[PDB]
Amino acid sequence: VGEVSVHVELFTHPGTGEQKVTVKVVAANDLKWQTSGIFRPFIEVNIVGPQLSDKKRKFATKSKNNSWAPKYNESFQFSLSADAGPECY
Amino acid sequence: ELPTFKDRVPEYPAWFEPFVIQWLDENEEVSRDFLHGALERDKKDGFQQTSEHALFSCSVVDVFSQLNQSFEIIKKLECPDPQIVGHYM
Amino acid sequence: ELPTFKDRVPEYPAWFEPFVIQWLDENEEVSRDFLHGALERDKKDGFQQTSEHALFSCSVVDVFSQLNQSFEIIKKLECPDPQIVGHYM
Fold first, then answer.
1. Nearest by Cα to B50 from B39, B61, B40
2. Alpha-carbon distance B64 to nearest alpha carbon in chain A (angstroms)
3. From CA C33, how far away is CA C52, in angstroms rounded?
4. How far is Cα A7 from Cα A66, in angstroms, rounded to an integer?
5. CB-based burial of residue B58 (10 Å sphere; 0-12 exposed, 13-18 middle, 19+ buried)?
6. Where in the chain are disulfide-linked cysteines found (chains B, C)?
7. CA distance B26 to B16
8. What CA–CA distance (Å, rounded) separates B63 from B37?
9. Set of chain B residues whose Cβ sits within 8 Å of the Cβ of A69
10. Which terminus of chain B has a smaller tally of CB atoms within 10 A, N or C?
11. How far apart are the C-alpha atoms of A56 and A46, rounded to whole Å?
12. Rounded Cα distance, A86 and A56, in Å
């Protein structure tokens, strides 16, 4: 229904040996959503995996008006657990 | 970085070239169908200038976005065979 | 106190943070203009010691006073996001 360009950097966090996940949301494209109104796309990013109760599971880009190919260039930083490896997420 | 293959233009891109070409084709069709969408939106909107300084209407932005997405994929391949690159280009 | 948001570091400080930074900016520039004024008032006072046992001159005091008035305006926000705090700091 479209696509999202992301650049993602796993950091086995050079400051801690936890894992942190930088997610640069670059853009979306080909969004199948030529809507009955003002389209205002934004991109939610969520991390999924174990031990996330204490952590910010969700981010979102700003919205972009009337844009089926919205650029964002917005960089988020999830924390994973320390224990569960990146393959648990 | 092994001497044995720093001594060569890498041969592996020649394996993938037919697939990248097929992808470039698919991408052209997707681009030309996206274009008609982008234009039909803009035309139905009566070609509003994107803003009072973006003197052009939105379909330009859509189209170049599509093209740029398309280009950036190719560019990220960084194909080390300049003849395969010339062919892609 | 709703469980849903007791579960979380409040996200609202991310909203205000740019306006706080703007404030910190207005504040610094005011503080640097103030600094020059204070130094110059003290210079006009020939840089007398604040007393014969308070061996520095008054501009030092004025500046720390200002910096503290300023810091306290920040501190009075008690932003529950410590990274947004870290940014202010």
1. B61
2. 10
3. 28
4. 24
5. buried
6. none
7. 15
8. 10
9. 61-62, 65-66, 69
10. N
11. 9
12. 17
